[PDB]
C-alpha cells in the first residue's frame, strides 16, 4: 500500500540474471539525460524509471541510494535472492557481501552493483587493454619512417601488454572482478549525482530544443509526483524543490571527507594507483554535480534574498571544507575538475552574498517581498560568515578571491552606514551642547541590525581590514583574470564544462560583482577587460546561433542587462561608446559579443544594430589644424564645452565621399592630458568604419582625422562587421529578407567609385597577405581570419561575389603554377593565430561546397568554370591539411578534433555532392580526393590521421561534464568513420584500390570494434563501418580476410554480444537496424568464423 516498492528500480533477481530485464544503472540514466539526449529520454524504460515513486525518494534524499548497511537491508538481501545453468548465485552473493563490507553500503545496493557489473561484462572486455598482437596491427597500419612517433605516443597511451589467452585468465580472477566491482560502484555514484543534476535541468527548463519537445507529459509527471509542483495549479507549491538545496548541501561534507581518505574498511591492494585516482575523481564529480543542482535551486528565486539559514549553512560548509581548496591533485583526470569545482564554489557563494541586493538594502533602497529575509538582519550570521571569508583572504585561497572582493564591498558599505548614523547622532549632541552652554539627554545612535557585529571586529572605527581584502583580491589574488577563466569554464564555448544555460546564469554572479565594484574602481583596463571576458564566455564567431541557450529567455539576462541595467549600461556600455573610436577595442568588442549572443531576441538586436547605424557621438584625437574651426561654449573655464564654428572633414584628399561635421555641432575636450575631443556628431559607425577601411588600402592617398587604424583595430573592426552581418542574416525572414543586404550597403554607403565594403575587405585580404607574405606577424594573421569570417558571413547574401573573388583569392588559387598561398603561410608553424587562420579557411571552404548543393535548386558571379577551380583548390588544400595534421602541434586536442572533423567533412561532401550539380563542376575536386586516398603511393601515410581519430575516440575521458568536448570528439569520430565507408564503396565501385585502405581498416578493426563500448554515439557509426568493410572484402576476387581473425576469439564474442545488447536498453529503431545490417552482411559475405560466433 503505502511503502514504495523496490521492484521497478531493482527487478526480481531471476529476470536480471537471465537477461530478460537489463537493470537501468545510473550510468545509463545519466547518459539518457546528457546535454544532447532526447530520443533516449522518451524510451519506456527511462520514462518508467523517472516516474517511479521509489526513485523519487532517492532524488529527495540522496543518502538513501548507497545507504550504510542495516538489518533491514540484510533481510531484504536474503529475500531478494531466496526467490530463485549456474551464473554462480553463490559467487554473486559472495561479491555483494564483499562489496557491501568494503565500501560500507547496504547489501541491496551492493547487489544492484554486482548485477550491473555482471550485465556489462562484454563492455568491460572491450574497454580493457589491447593484446600485443592488436598493437602490432595498429603499428603496421601506421607504418611510417618518421610519423610512427606520433603513432607510438598513441600506442603507448592505449596501454599495451597482453597475450589474449591469459587476458581472459586475468578477467575471470577474483581480484580483477572485484576491482571491476569497485569501479562499477564508483561509476554509479558519479552517475547518480550527474543524473539528479541533469534531471533538474530537464524539469526546470520548459520548451528546450530536444526532439519533439512534448516531453512535457514526462516533465509534469515528475514535477507533481516528486516535488508536488503543479504548473497548472493556482499558486504552485515549491517547498519540495526548495528543500533540495539544504539537502544536497549536506552531501558536500561527505564528498570532502571521501576526497581525503578511502574507507579504512577496504581490502589492501584494491588500492592501486588507478583506484586512488578514480576514488578522488568520484568525490570531486559528486561535489560538482551537487553544486550544479544547488545553483539551479537557488536560481529559482533569483533577484531576492536567499533564506538566511541557507546562507549560513553554505558558509559553515565552506569553513569546514576550507572552500574546497585542499584537494589531492596529482592526475590529469583530477586536474580538469578543479576549475569547474572552484567556479561553482565562487558562483554559489556570490549568489548567496548577493552583493547587488545587499548594497541596495543597506542604502534602504529596496523593499523586501512577503517572506524575504536578508542574512544582514542578524549580526550573528554576519559574525560567522565574516571569519570564514576573512580566513580565506588571509590564506590567499585563489579561487575565493571573488567572494573576498564582494565581501569587502559589503563591509565598506556597513562601515559607511555606521559613520553616517554616528555623525547624524554626534550632530544632535553638538546642537544640544550649544543650547546647554548657554548661561541632560544622552542622545544615542540610530540602531542598525549589523552594528554589534561591526563593533566586534572594530570595523565601525577601522575599515582597513576591508580595504586590505580588496587589495589582496585585485592584486596578488588576480580576481579579474580569475573570473575571466571561470567565465570560460562557465561559458558557451568548446572548453566549457557546463550546460550553456547553467553557465549563463552563473556568470551573472560575476557580472553583479563588477556592477558594484565600478563604484570604487574607475573604468580601468582590468575590470573592463574582465567584463568583456565574462560576456564573451569563451565563445567565437563559429558559435553564433539563431537560437538562445536551450531556448531559454532568462539565459540571455547577462547579455540584455548591458542594456537594461542602469549601472552596467552607464558605467560600462555607454562609457565604452563615449570613448570610441579613440579607444577602439572595448566598444567594438562589446557590440560584437552582444549582437552575436542576442540573435534570438529581436528587441535587443535592433537596439544594438540601431546604435551602430545611429550613433550619437564620436571621440577622436583633435587635429591641431582645427584650432580655429571652433568656439568655446561656456561655463567654469572650459577644457570642456566648445562649438564648431566651421565644418571639419574627417577625410581629406592628398569627391563627395567625405565625413564632414557641420558647424554648430557641440563638443568637449576629454583630457587636458592630451588632445582628445568628444563630438556630438550623430552618424553611422558601420558606414564610418567602412570608409576608414578603404583609406587604409590607399596608403597615404587620403588624410584621416581618425588616424591610421592599426592591426588590432583591423582585426576587431572586421570581426564586428562579420558578426553583425551574420546576426542580421540569421534574423532575416521570408517576409523580411535582405537584412544582411541592408547591412552590406549601409557599410558601403560612404565609399568611392561605386565600390562596396565587399571589395574593400577583399582588397584588404589580398593586400594583407602580400604584407603577410612577410609572415612573421600574428596580428596581421588574425586580420586574415576576420576577412575570411566576413566572406563566410557574406556568402548567404551575395554568393556570386564570394565565388568570383575566390577565383582570384591568392590564398588558394594553385591555379596557373602552384600559387597556393594559405599552405605556405599556415604550415610554417601551427599555434595561436595560425590555427585560427587555418580554421577560418577550412570553415569557409566548407560553406563553399555547401553553397554548390543549394545552387542546384545575387548569384551572378558563379559559373561552372569558376566553381570548378575553386572547389578543386579547396580539395587540394583540404588533402594537404589533413595529411599534414599528423605531424602538426595544435593548441589543444579539442582544437585538433575540430580541425580534423571539418577538413574530413569537406572531402566527404565533395564525393557526396558530385552527382547532383558530363563531368560536373565538383567532379575534378571529387576526383582529386578519390585519387589522393586510393593511390598506395602515399595511402600508407595518409591513413595515420584516420587512425589518430580512432585512438583519440578510444581515449575520451569518462566524464559527465565537459560535454561539448565529448560531442566534438564524437563528431570527429563519426565523420572519419563515415568518410572511410564512402571510400571503401567508391573504391569497390571503380574496382581500383581495394588493396591497402581495406587492409589498413582490418589492421585497425581491433580498435574500431572496441569503440561501441566507449560511448553510445560511437556504436552505430563503428558497426556501420565494419559492415562496409566486410561487404568490400566479399567483393575481392579471392578469399576475404577473417574479421574474427583480426579481433580474436574473445573480443569477437564480446562484440557480437553488444550488438544484441545494442537492441536492448532503449529500444531505439536505429540501433536494431544496425545490428540487423551487420549480422546480415556477415552471413552473406563468407565470414564463417564470425557467422558461427553469431549463434554461440
Tab-separated table of C-alpha atoms in Angstrom, residues 314-646:
chain	number	residue	atom	x	y	z
A	314	UNK	CA	26.728	27.192	2.998
A	315	UNK	CA	29.384	29.329	4.682
A	316	UNK	CA	29.621	26.935	7.610
A	317	UNK	CA	30.295	24.264	4.983
A	318	UNK	CA	32.933	26.400	3.229
A	319	UNK	CA	34.513	26.874	6.652
A	320	UNK	CA	34.809	23.173	7.463
A	321	UNK	CA	35.827	22.281	3.912
A	322	UNK	CA	38.179	25.271	3.564
A	323	UNK	CA	36.291	26.410	0.465
A	324	UNK	CA	37.101	23.081	-1.236
A	325	UNK	CA	40.660	24.233	-1.865
A	326	UNK	CA	42.676	21.433	-0.222
A	327	UNK	CA	42.355	18.535	-2.674
A	328	UNK	CA	44.873	15.858	-3.781
A	329	UNK	CA	45.608	16.964	-7.344
A	330	UNK	CA	48.062	14.523	-8.928
A	331	UNK	CA	46.466	13.102	-12.075
A	332	UNK	CA	45.099	14.921	-15.139
A	333	UNK	CA	41.614	13.478	-14.621
A	334	UNK	CA	41.590	15.225	-11.246
A	335	UNK	CA	43.190	18.364	-12.668
A	336	UNK	CA	40.496	19.213	-15.222
A	337	UNK	CA	37.838	19.119	-12.474
A	338	UNK	CA	39.449	21.777	-10.266
A	339	UNK	CA	38.375	24.843	-12.268
A	340	UNK	CA	34.729	23.689	-12.642
A	341	UNK	CA	34.589	22.916	-8.908
A	342	UNK	CA	36.074	26.273	-7.965
A	343	UNK	CA	33.804	28.101	-10.424
A	344	UNK	CA	30.698	26.632	-8.815
A	345	UNK	CA	32.080	27.397	-5.349
A	346	UNK	CA	32.646	31.053	-6.285
A	347	UNK	CA	29.336	31.450	-8.123
A	348	UNK	CA	27.251	29.868	-5.329
A	349	UNK	CA	28.978	31.944	-2.641
A	350	UNK	CA	28.396	35.118	-4.694
A	351	UNK	CA	24.788	34.159	-5.419
A	352	UNK	CA	24.214	33.855	-1.668
A	353	UNK	CA	26.084	37.040	-0.713
A	354	UNK	CA	24.004	38.736	-3.397
A	355	UNK	CA	26.231	41.808	-3.387
A	356	UNK	CA	23.829	43.851	-5.547
A	357	UNK	CA	20.663	43.441	-3.476
A	358	UNK	CA	22.746	43.614	-0.306
A	359	UNK	CA	24.229	47.040	-1.126
A	360	UNK	CA	20.800	48.327	-2.207
A	361	UNK	CA	19.216	47.107	1.025
A	362	UNK	CA	21.977	48.739	3.070
A	363	UNK	CA	21.130	52.028	1.319
A	364	UNK	CA	17.485	51.479	2.292
A	365	UNK	CA	16.778	51.477	-1.432
A	366	UNK	CA	14.891	48.190	-1.718
A	367	UNK	CA	11.565	46.844	-0.446
A	368	UNK	CA	11.548	43.227	0.730
A	369	UNK	CA	8.922	40.810	-0.565
A	370	UNK	CA	6.499	38.784	1.599
A	371	UNK	CA	8.749	36.090	3.063
A	372	UNK	CA	12.093	37.625	2.108
A	373	UNK	CA	14.695	37.951	4.863
A	374	UNK	CA	18.302	39.040	4.292
A	375	UNK	CA	21.150	37.441	6.233
A	376	UNK	CA	22.145	41.014	7.141
A	377	UNK	CA	19.245	41.243	9.576
A	378	UNK	CA	21.335	39.262	12.085
A	379	UNK	CA	24.741	40.187	13.494
A	380	UNK	CA	25.294	36.548	14.479
A	381	UNK	CA	25.017	35.462	10.846
A	382	UNK	CA	27.484	38.147	9.803
A	383	UNK	CA	29.966	37.186	12.505
A	384	UNK	CA	30.170	33.584	11.236
A	385	UNK	CA	30.357	34.480	7.548
A	386	UNK	CA	32.989	37.111	8.286
A	387	UNK	CA	35.596	34.886	9.946
A	388	UNK	CA	35.216	32.321	7.160
A	389	UNK	CA	35.706	34.834	4.330
A	390	UNK	CA	38.423	36.648	6.271
A	391	UNK	CA	40.267	33.351	6.759
A	392	UNK	CA	40.122	32.668	3.019
A	393	UNK	CA	41.513	36.156	2.355
A	394	UNK	CA	44.328	35.645	4.884
A	395	UNK	CA	45.341	32.253	3.485
A	396	UNK	CA	45.172	33.696	-0.011
A	397	UNK	CA	42.978	30.922	-1.401
A	398	UNK	CA	42.931	31.980	-5.055
A	399	UNK	CA	39.526	30.575	-6.019
A	400	UNK	CA	37.811	32.545	-3.237
A	401	UNK	CA	39.009	35.982	-4.358
A	402	UNK	CA	35.671	36.935	-5.946
A	403	UNK	CA	33.991	36.127	-2.613
A	404	UNK	CA	36.619	38.150	-0.757
A	405	UNK	CA	36.154	41.066	-3.161
A	406	UNK	CA	32.341	41.046	-2.900
A	407	UNK	CA	32.527	40.858	0.883
A	408	UNK	CA	34.933	43.801	1.093
A	409	UNK	CA	32.237	45.932	-0.590
A	410	UNK	CA	29.556	44.776	1.828
A	411	UNK	CA	31.862	45.560	4.757
A	412	UNK	CA	32.693	49.020	3.454
A	413	UNK	CA	29.007	49.810	2.960
A	414	UNK	CA	28.229	48.801	6.546
A	415	UNK	CA	31.058	50.991	7.773
A	416	UNK	CA	29.747	53.937	5.761
A	417	UNK	CA	26.212	53.433	7.083
A	418	UNK	CA	27.585	53.414	10.611
A	419	UNK	CA	29.665	56.568	10.155
A	420	UNK	CA	26.634	58.333	8.676
A	421	UNK	CA	24.441	57.463	11.668
A	422	UNK	CA	27.317	58.311	14.015
A	423	UNK	CA	27.688	61.808	12.557
A	424	UNK	CA	23.920	62.287	12.424
A	425	UNK	CA	23.933	61.491	16.163
A	426	UNK	CA	27.058	63.446	17.069
A	427	UNK	CA	25.441	66.421	15.350
A	428	UNK	CA	22.461	66.318	17.715
A	429	UNK	CA	24.979	66.019	20.535
A	430	UNK	CA	26.545	69.313	19.447
A	431	UNK	CA	23.265	71.182	18.949
A	432	UNK	CA	22.271	70.176	22.470
A	433	UNK	CA	25.798	71.119	23.521
A	434	UNK	CA	25.384	74.661	22.169
A	435	UNK	CA	21.977	75.126	23.809
A	436	UNK	CA	23.375	73.831	27.096
A	437	UNK	CA	26.461	76.022	27.464
A	438	UNK	CA	24.096	78.991	27.280
A	439	UNK	CA	24.362	80.807	30.627
A	440	UNK	CA	20.893	66.406	30.002
A	441	UNK	CA	19.621	63.891	27.453
A	442	UNK	CA	22.287	61.409	26.341
A	443	UNK	CA	21.440	61.065	22.639
A	444	UNK	CA	22.107	57.582	21.262
A	445	UNK	CA	22.806	56.379	17.730
A	446	UNK	CA	20.171	55.136	15.292
A	447	UNK	CA	20.013	51.346	15.563
A	448	UNK	CA	21.012	49.002	12.772
A	449	UNK	CA	20.793	45.225	12.550
A	450	UNK	CA	24.544	44.865	11.945
A	451	UNK	CA	26.211	47.222	14.425
A	452	UNK	CA	27.172	44.767	17.153
A	453	UNK	CA	28.926	42.638	14.518
A	454	UNK	CA	30.730	45.754	13.268
A	455	UNK	CA	31.963	46.649	16.757
A	456	UNK	CA	33.119	43.066	17.450
A	457	UNK	CA	35.643	43.312	14.600
A	458	UNK	CA	36.349	47.039	15.077
A	459	UNK	CA	35.054	47.703	11.552
A	460	UNK	CA	32.978	50.653	12.780
A	461	UNK	CA	36.058	52.693	13.657
A	462	UNK	CA	38.614	50.902	11.476
A	463	UNK	CA	37.837	49.821	7.919
A	464	UNK	CA	41.421	48.796	6.981
A	465	UNK	CA	40.588	45.056	7.047
A	466	UNK	CA	38.002	45.584	4.286
A	467	UNK	CA	40.334	47.764	2.232
A	468	UNK	CA	43.046	45.121	2.537
A	469	UNK	CA	40.729	42.326	1.368
A	470	UNK	CA	40.015	44.302	-1.802
A	471	UNK	CA	43.739	44.913	-2.158
A	472	UNK	CA	44.526	41.199	-1.828
A	473	UNK	CA	41.840	40.222	-4.334
A	474	UNK	CA	42.641	42.799	-7.014
A	475	UNK	CA	46.394	42.480	-6.506
A	476	UNK	CA	48.117	39.167	-5.782
A	477	UNK	CA	44.716	37.448	-5.823
A	478	UNK	CA	44.299	38.323	-9.521
A	479	UNK	CA	40.492	38.203	-9.215
A	480	UNK	CA	39.972	39.816	-12.641
A	481	UNK	CA	41.933	37.195	-14.551
A	482	UNK	CA	40.405	34.570	-12.268
A	483	UNK	CA	36.805	35.477	-13.106
A	484	UNK	CA	37.724	35.547	-16.811
A	485	UNK	CA	38.859	31.908	-16.565
A	486	UNK	CA	35.790	30.896	-14.567
A	487	UNK	CA	33.724	32.568	-17.277
A	488	UNK	CA	35.246	30.306	-19.950
A	489	UNK	CA	34.588	27.300	-17.734
A	490	UNK	CA	31.042	28.581	-17.243
A	491	UNK	CA	30.990	29.739	-20.846
A	492	UNK	CA	29.374	28.776	-24.114
A	493	UNK	CA	32.483	27.714	-25.988
A	494	UNK	CA	34.084	24.359	-26.708
A	495	UNK	CA	36.132	24.454	-23.498
A	496	UNK	CA	33.011	24.954	-21.407
A	497	UNK	CA	32.479	22.454	-18.592
A	498	UNK	CA	28.766	23.016	-18.007
A	499	UNK	CA	25.483	23.300	-19.894
A	500	UNK	CA	25.318	26.759	-21.533
A	501	UNK	CA	22.160	27.512	-19.533
A	502	UNK	CA	23.809	26.900	-16.184
A	503	UNK	CA	26.904	28.821	-17.242
A	504	UNK	CA	24.915	31.813	-18.474
A	505	UNK	CA	23.036	32.065	-15.164
A	506	UNK	CA	26.211	31.571	-13.122
A	507	UNK	CA	28.257	34.213	-14.960
A	508	UNK	CA	25.515	36.575	-13.782
A	509	UNK	CA	27.005	36.475	-10.274
A	510	UNK	CA	30.340	37.639	-11.649
A	511	UNK	CA	28.692	40.475	-13.558
A	512	UNK	CA	26.987	41.667	-10.348
A	513	UNK	CA	30.371	41.937	-8.643
A	514	UNK	CA	31.666	44.144	-11.483
A	515	UNK	CA	28.462	46.180	-11.496
A	516	UNK	CA	29.097	47.109	-7.862
A	517	UNK	CA	32.888	47.362	-7.801
A	518	UNK	CA	32.681	50.022	-10.526
A	519	UNK	CA	31.749	52.498	-7.812
A	520	UNK	CA	35.147	52.046	-6.127
A	521	UNK	CA	37.228	51.218	-9.202
A	522	UNK	CA	37.010	53.507	-12.201
A	523	UNK	CA	36.687	52.460	-15.810
A	524	UNK	CA	40.068	50.747	-15.711
A	525	UNK	CA	41.695	48.273	-18.104
A	526	UNK	CA	41.276	45.217	-15.857
A	527	UNK	CA	37.581	45.378	-14.844
A	528	UNK	CA	36.594	46.320	-18.398
A	529	UNK	CA	38.593	43.505	-19.987
A	530	UNK	CA	37.248	41.100	-17.363
A	531	UNK	CA	33.667	42.167	-18.057
A	532	UNK	CA	34.197	41.601	-21.786
A	533	UNK	CA	35.503	38.104	-20.954
A	534	UNK	CA	32.534	37.327	-18.705
A	535	UNK	CA	30.213	38.345	-21.532
A	536	UNK	CA	32.184	36.515	-24.206
A	537	UNK	CA	32.354	33.327	-22.141
A	538	UNK	CA	34.959	31.858	-24.469
A	539	UNK	CA	32.652	31.945	-27.488
A	540	UNK	CA	33.769	32.829	-31.004
A	541	UNK	CA	32.327	33.659	-34.427
A	542	UNK	CA	31.732	29.990	-35.290
A	543	UNK	CA	29.444	29.529	-32.282
A	544	UNK	CA	26.943	32.153	-33.496
A	545	UNK	CA	23.436	30.703	-33.488
A	546	UNK	CA	19.865	31.651	-34.356
A	547	UNK	CA	18.687	30.225	-31.038
A	548	UNK	CA	19.151	31.078	-27.354
A	549	UNK	CA	20.903	28.716	-24.880
A	550	UNK	CA	18.395	25.826	-24.759
A	551	UNK	CA	15.681	28.247	-25.925
A	552	UNK	CA	15.718	29.932	-22.500
A	553	UNK	CA	14.637	33.577	-22.234
A	554	UNK	CA	16.243	34.311	-18.868
A	555	UNK	CA	19.514	32.735	-20.003
A	556	UNK	CA	20.179	35.910	-22.005
A	557	UNK	CA	19.985	38.166	-18.915
A	558	UNK	CA	23.751	38.602	-18.677
A	559	UNK	CA	23.661	39.976	-22.216
A	560	UNK	CA	20.448	42.022	-22.018
A	561	UNK	CA	21.478	43.578	-18.686
A	562	UNK	CA	24.178	45.507	-20.568
A	563	UNK	CA	21.244	47.471	-21.984
A	564	UNK	CA	18.530	47.341	-19.326
A	565	UNK	CA	20.584	47.795	-16.148
A	566	UNK	CA	21.237	51.434	-15.264
A	567	UNK	CA	24.631	50.867	-13.648
A	568	UNK	CA	26.184	48.472	-16.178
A	569	UNK	CA	24.821	50.455	-19.094
A	570	UNK	CA	26.110	53.804	-17.835
A	571	UNK	CA	29.341	52.722	-16.160
A	572	UNK	CA	30.478	50.231	-18.820
A	573	UNK	CA	28.487	50.015	-22.048
A	574	UNK	CA	27.790	53.709	-22.639
A	575	UNK	CA	31.204	54.503	-21.177
A	576	UNK	CA	32.865	52.465	-23.925
A	577	UNK	CA	30.885	54.274	-26.606
A	578	UNK	CA	31.876	57.664	-25.158
A	579	UNK	CA	35.492	56.800	-25.963
A	580	UNK	CA	35.128	55.294	-29.417
A	581	UNK	CA	36.959	55.145	-31.715
A	582	UNK	CA	39.761	56.881	-29.767
A	583	UNK	CA	39.745	53.678	-27.769
A	584	UNK	CA	38.651	51.097	-30.315
A	585	UNK	CA	38.700	47.654	-28.686
A	586	UNK	CA	36.202	47.838	-25.803
A	587	UNK	CA	33.229	49.350	-27.634
A	588	UNK	CA	33.770	47.190	-30.704
A	589	UNK	CA	34.231	44.005	-28.653
A	590	UNK	CA	31.046	44.673	-26.728
A	591	UNK	CA	28.807	45.232	-29.731
A	592	UNK	CA	30.193	42.136	-31.429
A	593	UNK	CA	29.681	39.989	-28.322
A	594	UNK	CA	26.170	41.235	-27.578
A	595	UNK	CA	24.846	41.057	-31.156
A	596	UNK	CA	26.298	37.561	-31.574
A	597	UNK	CA	24.578	36.465	-28.373
A	598	UNK	CA	21.262	38.266	-28.840
A	599	UNK	CA	20.263	36.917	-32.259
A	600	UNK	CA	17.131	35.254	-30.861
A	601	UNK	CA	15.917	38.495	-29.230
A	602	UNK	CA	14.619	40.996	-31.801
A	603	UNK	CA	14.076	43.943	-29.458
A	604	UNK	CA	17.653	43.648	-28.212
A	605	UNK	CA	19.226	43.117	-31.634
A	606	UNK	CA	17.506	46.224	-33.018
A	607	UNK	CA	18.873	48.322	-30.160
A	608	UNK	CA	22.435	47.172	-30.851
A	609	UNK	CA	22.265	47.411	-34.647
A	610	UNK	CA	20.302	50.651	-34.407
A	611	UNK	CA	23.060	52.058	-32.222
A	612	UNK	CA	25.712	51.078	-34.775
A	613	UNK	CA	23.735	52.846	-37.507
A	614	UNK	CA	22.627	55.833	-35.423
A	615	UNK	CA	25.494	56.653	-33.039
A	616	UNK	CA	25.074	60.000	-31.140
A	617	UNK	CA	28.738	60.852	-30.517
A	618	UNK	CA	32.292	60.327	-31.766
A	619	UNK	CA	35.519	60.596	-29.774
A	620	UNK	CA	38.822	61.183	-31.532
A	621	UNK	CA	42.195	62.885	-31.397
A	622	UNK	CA	41.914	66.604	-32.034
A	623	UNK	CA	43.703	67.689	-35.200
A	624	UNK	CA	45.723	70.762	-34.123
A	625	UNK	CA	44.958	72.158	-37.586
A	626	UNK	CA	41.410	72.764	-36.333
A	627	UNK	CA	42.326	75.279	-33.628
A	628	UNK	CA	40.354	77.973	-35.461
A	629	UNK	CA	37.324	75.963	-36.550
A	630	UNK	CA	35.718	76.133	-33.101
A	631	UNK	CA	34.469	78.497	-30.395
A	632	UNK	CA	34.181	77.746	-26.679
A	633	UNK	CA	30.637	77.320	-25.440
A	634	UNK	CA	30.858	78.311	-21.825
A	635	UNK	CA	30.842	77.676	-18.068
A	636	UNK	CA	33.549	77.132	-15.421
A	637	UNK	CA	36.688	77.581	-17.532
A	638	UNK	CA	36.272	75.100	-20.303
A	639	UNK	CA	38.704	72.487	-21.370
A	640	UNK	CA	35.214	71.100	-21.867
A	641	UNK	CA	32.484	72.724	-23.932
A	642	UNK	CA	33.111	74.076	-27.419
A	643	UNK	CA	31.162	74.587	-30.631
A	644	UNK	CA	32.348	74.045	-34.192
A	645	UNK	CA	32.305	77.408	-35.979
A	646	UNK	CA	33.209	75.867	-39.338
